Every structure is written in structure tokens, then in C-alpha cells.
């Protein structure tokens, strides 16, 4: 839209899920298992391919 | 809402005009500047209790903590209207120490 205007990751995807109905608490309380859940998928999808 | 689709930025309005084989749309669009840096902080426990903004974020201009929202600065205190609890500062990273105003207490003295 505008200039480039930094933010921490972790925030922005506790922006991400607001924006979907689910608060941002679920993601601070569930940072580990998410990270990991990302890091095996985007590793599945490099067998996938 | 959808990005980018008429305008460039965040849409408001549109006017239509004619043409000899054609439309013309004015665009109207709402941009930022004159931008600033700060320090930010997820969430802040004070008496064991982690609070969480309601609509903003919090900022620090290097002493004081305040609540913002995201487009634009204009800081408030922190008081337990704006903000909601959630659980104990034990398990969230990034908590730093502060202290959360109430009304109740000075109202009622
Ligand atoms: C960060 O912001 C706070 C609040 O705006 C500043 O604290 C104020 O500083 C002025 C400067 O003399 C005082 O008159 C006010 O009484 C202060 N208010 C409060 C609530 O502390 C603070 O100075 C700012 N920090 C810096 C480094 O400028
Ligand atoms: C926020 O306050 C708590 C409690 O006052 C701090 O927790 C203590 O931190 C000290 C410093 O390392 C430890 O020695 C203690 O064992 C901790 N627990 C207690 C019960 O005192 C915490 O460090 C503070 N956090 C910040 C960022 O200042
Ligand atoms: C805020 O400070 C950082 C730290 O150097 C700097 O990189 C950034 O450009 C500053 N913000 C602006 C708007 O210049």
C-alpha cells in the first residue's frame, strides 16, 4: 500500500489469526507446536513434489 | 476490501464519468506517512496475570509503555478497559515487567 514498515514475525501472524476469528492468545500459547507442524509440512511437500 | 483491485492503498470512494466508447473511474485512496520506530512487547503480566491488547498494540517511546492502533499513533494509557487476561507470564516469550492502571480503586477513594 505504502512504505515498508517493519514487524516481528510473531505478530503478524497473531494479526494473521485475528483477522480469521480465533484471537491472538491461542497463537502466543501455541507457538512451538505451530512452528513445528509448518517446518513438517513444508518438508512433506518437498517429497511431494 | 480486496487489495489492489480498484486503487492503490486502502480504497474510500470511486466517481464514474463517460468517454466516447468508454468508462472512466476516479479512484480516491488513503495513504500513510511521516512514519516513526518504536519498541513493541507482546503481552505484559502484572500480579502474575498476562494482559493482551484488545484493538492495538503496545509501544514504548523508551520509559513509558502505551496501546496504539496499527494505522495510526495516537498513545493511550494502559488500563484494564482496553485489555484482557489470559493465563500466567510463564509460557509466552517476549513478557516484559510493567504495571496496569484501574479506575476502581482511585474512583472509590
Ligand atoms: C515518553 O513519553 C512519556 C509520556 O508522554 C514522557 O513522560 C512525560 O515527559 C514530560 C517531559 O517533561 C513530562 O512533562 C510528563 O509529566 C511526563 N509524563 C509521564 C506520564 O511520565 C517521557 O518523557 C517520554 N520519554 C522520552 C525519552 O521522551
Ligand atoms: C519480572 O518480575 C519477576 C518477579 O519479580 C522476575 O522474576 C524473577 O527474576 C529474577 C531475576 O533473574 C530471578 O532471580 C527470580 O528467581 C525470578 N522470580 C522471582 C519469583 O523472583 C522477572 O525476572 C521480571 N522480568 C523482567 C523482564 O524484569
Ligand atoms: C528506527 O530505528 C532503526 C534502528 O536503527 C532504524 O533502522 C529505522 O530506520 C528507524 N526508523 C526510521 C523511520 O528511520
Known sequence: AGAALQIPFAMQMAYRFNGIGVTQNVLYENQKLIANQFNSAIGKIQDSL | ?109
Open chain 2, 1 to 109: 476490501k480486496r487489495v489492489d483491485f480498484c486503487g492503490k492503498g486502502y480504497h474510500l470512494m470511486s466517481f464514474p464519468q463517460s468517454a466516447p466508447h468508454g468508462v472512466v473511474f476516479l479512484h480516491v485512496t488513503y495513504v500513510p506517512a511521516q512514519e516513526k520506530n518504536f519498541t513493541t512487547a507482546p503481552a505484559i503480566c502484572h500480579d502474575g496475570k498476562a494482559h493482551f491488547p484488545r484493538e492495538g498494540v503496545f509501544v514504548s517511546n523508551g520509559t513509558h509503555w502505551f496501546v496504539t492502533q496499527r494505522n495510526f499513533y495516537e498513545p493511550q494509557i494502559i488500563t484494564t478497559d482496553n485489555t484482557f487476561v489470559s493465563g500466567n507470564c510463564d509460557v509466552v516469550i517476549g513478557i516484559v515487567n510493567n504495571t496496569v492502571y484501574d479506575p476502581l480503586q482511585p474512583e472509590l477513594d
